[PDB]
Amino acid sequence: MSVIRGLAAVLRQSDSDISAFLVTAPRKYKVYKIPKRTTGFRVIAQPAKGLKDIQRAFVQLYSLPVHDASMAYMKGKGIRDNAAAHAGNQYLLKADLEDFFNSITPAIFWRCIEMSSAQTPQFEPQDKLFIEKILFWQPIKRRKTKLILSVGAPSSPVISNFCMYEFDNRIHAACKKVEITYTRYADDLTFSSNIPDVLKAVPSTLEVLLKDLFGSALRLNHSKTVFSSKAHNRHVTGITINNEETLSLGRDRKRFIKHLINQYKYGLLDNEDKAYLIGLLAFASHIEPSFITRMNEKYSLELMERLRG
């Protein structure tokens, strides 16, 4: 019934120790910096050991609805499925959102769980205290009223999918009536179609629907809208689409892989680059499997089986 007994049973512990620990579950975090691929840093925060266990346990007791058009953080699927759906259409459009994780707060969640078009679970009114202390971070020590959703915590992916449920539900049903295809990854939106002058209308529709559902809280980033066609470059989440209507690793990456094999032929390569080359060939086999059949023709199968792990 109540969450405290449920957690105490699943963790196999006495329930008074759960309520004693949860008093200050916010502030139990570590903070650090990671480098960008060109120049500068990105800032990350991760929850302390043992609070991880309570989060993993909580997501066993309950479940929440997800729409089919979502592609991230779901089991069995991956980025190839997202790229494959658009591959038959000659016109393309893309868009993006401001501050997707930090923009979510308890007031958004408690509205969405109540007003839903689908079968959300019931809860005890007094358990809401413990639910808020499990799910949210307090970044500033004195401004104790700030609570936000962190990207680095095991439960956040599921909650971020649930909050989008009605937005995905409506926009997909609208696109079907006009011959337009829609999919969504973590925070990318992608649209495509095979007839002209239909895509020009779409950006205006999104901006009305966002303020209708969320008010001021989430918004479209105006600086990132892009249009393309069969006459220019096209790619989706790192995968290129060629003029023969098939997926590709792109010419520039293919030529760089050829160079590393030629260094290995004459024994010039060393252990770091040898490890890196094996990792790339393991990935390349999943997306463009005909490439390996040409590499063991330009080079002997004898050399290729020696290189392979």
């Binding site: 060109t38 120049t39 105006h222 760089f256």
Partner: protein, 397 residues
């Protein structure tokens, strides 16, 4: 670390400078300096650099009379046409403030640019009470995008918007640091508007700065009218030295380049000189075959001379290593190109400027139809006669 080497050996610019600073704290220095300096001579004898520099796109949200707008620009020339009250001046004002963040960071480490006013630039009936401006630049295949945003909230409101300026500091540091060890040529930026028309007098001088040192060329360059009172002082300094009868140039060569450009562009001036036999120093010109001092010229003559003379001095000081200094990189903005000009001069101004300065990007506006009569049709943009802040994209005829 190995990640930066795999990028740098592929021709990426920002990874090479990152290794140079980290390892200095010579392979990586030459890669930085050659990207900036390589070029060749075309079949017409004109020098062309391998990597160009220009603006690609602009966007405006709740700014003066515009709710939302987008525009795309050409690499060589662009011209805007309309009547009173359509936003022509308000576009050039937004670009000029954006360029000021580059100029401030070539002169000093960690400098500061200009702001938007919280009293008059916000739209009068917008419900959310804040405003935004956004841009994108290009600098060859080593880096294909550089973004910037400026913003501000209305007076007396409770919540403040922030600007995003860091990508402009990152590029300007490369030009500033490489130039101190060895030397390079540098880019030019300028604005001219309707504050150019003013009277002339001799009894004047500035006790601030020195007029013969290289970094004086950036002084007051985005102010709206040029410092023509600094041109006269510099031209007299060249005379007093040359009268006492690598690749840098002597004062005798620098003096000769400037005089040739002035006589070539202005239709009715044919010679110029300094003289000082009477006890004092004067500048003389030949005009309609007669001989006069600068204060006797008409307003239509003085304004056109004043524009051409100030641009040539800045070009000559900033590019010390070229054979013909008038061929460097830069961006120039000009509002109301036909102010004080007779109809027979109006129809030929633009093509003379494009002949004398071959590598600059020009952005220009007007409200008269004669000026267009030689221009191609991809260079032109125009507003709807029907508009009331509804037209969300500017387009060609």
């Amino acid at each position: 670390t190995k990640q930066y080497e795999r990028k740098a050996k592929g021709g990426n610019l920002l990874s090479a400078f990152e290794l140079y600073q980290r390892n200095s704290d010579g392979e990586w220095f030459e890669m930085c300096r050659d990207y900036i300096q390589d070029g060749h001579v075309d079949e017409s004898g004109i020098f062309r650099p391998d990597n160009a520099f220009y603006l690609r796109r602009l966007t405006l949200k709740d700014f003066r009379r515009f709710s939302l707008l987008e525009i795309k620009l050409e690499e060589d020339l662009t011209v805007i046409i309309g009547n009173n009250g359509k936003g022509k001046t308000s576009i050039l004002y937004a670009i000029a403030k954006t360029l000021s963040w580059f100029v401030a960071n070539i002169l000093k480490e960690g400098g500061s640019g200009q702001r938007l006013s919280e009293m008059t630039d916000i739209k009068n009936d917008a419900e959310d009470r804040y405003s935004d401006v956004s841009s994108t630049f290009f600098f060859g295949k080593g880096l294909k995008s550089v973004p910037i945003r400026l913003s501000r909230s209305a007076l007396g409101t409770a919540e403040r918007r922030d600007s995003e300026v860091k990508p402009a500091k990152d590029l300007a540091d490369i030009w500033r640091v490489i130039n101190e060890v060895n030397t390079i040529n540098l880019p030019t930026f300028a604005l001219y508007n309707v504050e150019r028309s003013q009277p002339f007098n001799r009894n004047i001088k500035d006790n601030t700065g020195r007029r013969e040192e290289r970094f004086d060329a950036y002084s007051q360059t985005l102010g709206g009218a040029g410092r023509f009172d600094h041109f006269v002082e510099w031209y007299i300094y060249l005379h007093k030295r040359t009268v006492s009868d690598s690749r840098v140039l002597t004062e005798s060569v620098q003096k000769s380049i400037v005089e040739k450009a002035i006589c070539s562009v202005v239709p009715s001036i044919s010679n110029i000189w300094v003289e000082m036999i009477t006890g004092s120093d004067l500048v003389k010109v030949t005009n309609d075959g007669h001989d006069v001092t600068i204060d006797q010229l008409s307003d239509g003559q003085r304004v056109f001379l004043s524009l051409v003379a100030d641009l040539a001095r800045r070009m000559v000081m900033l590019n010390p290593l070229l054979e013909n200094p008038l061929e460097g990189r830069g961006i120039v903005l000009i509002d109301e190109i036909e102010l004080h000009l007779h109809p027979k001069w109006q129809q030929e101004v633009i093509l003379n400027l494009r002949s004398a300065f071959p590598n600059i990007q020009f952005i220009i506006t007007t409200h008269s139809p004669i000026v267009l009569s030689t221009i191609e049709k991809r260079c032109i943009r125009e507003f709807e006669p029907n508009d009331d802040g509804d037209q969300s994209f500017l387009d060609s005829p």
